[PDB]
Amino acid sequence: PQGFSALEPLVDLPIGINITRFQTLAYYVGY
Amino acid sequence: LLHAPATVCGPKKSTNLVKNKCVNFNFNGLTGTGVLTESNKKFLPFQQF
C-alpha cells in the first residue's frame, strides 16, 4: 500500500547474545 | 557480573507525591526542579517523557 504507517515499539528483550542469521517458518524482506 | 544486561537487582524506595510546591524530584533518572500539576494533554500508551 501507498499509505503511511508508524511502527511503535512492542517489547524489549535484553539477552546480550550476538546474532548474525535469521530464518522464518508470501512475505517481504528488506535491509 | 557478566557483560549481559542486568536482569536482577535490589528494590527501590518510593515516597508520597506532592503538588503545588516546586521541590526536587527523581522519576526514572530524571532530576530537576519545578512546580507539579496535572495536565489536559494525553500521551501515547508507550511514550513516557
Which descriptor suits the 3D outline of chain A? flat
Largest β-sheet summary of chain A? none
Distance between the termini of chain A: 19 Å
Q: Which structural class do the helices and strands of chain A define?
A: little secondary structure
Enumerate how many helices of chain A there are, as a single number.
0
Rg calculated over all Cα atoms of chain A: 14 Å
Number of strands of chain A: 0
Largest interface: A-B, 5 and 7 residues
Q: Into which percentage range does the β-strand content of chain A fall?
A: under 5%
As an assembly, this protein is part of a larger assembly
* Approximate helicity band of chain A: under 10%
PDB class: viral protein
Keywords: Spike, SARS-CoV-2, viral protein
Entry title: Beta Variant SARS-CoV-2 Spike with 2 Erect RBDs
Chains A, B: Spike glycoprotein
Which tags fit this structure?
viral protein, little secondary structure, part of a larger assembly, 31 residues, SARS-CoV-2, Spike, 2 chains
Folded structure, characterized:
The structure is cut from a larger assembly and holds two copies of chain A. Chain A has 31 residues and is largely without helices or strands. Chain A contains no helices and no strands. Chain A is flat, with a radius of gyration of 14 Å. Chains A and B meet through loops of A and loops of B.
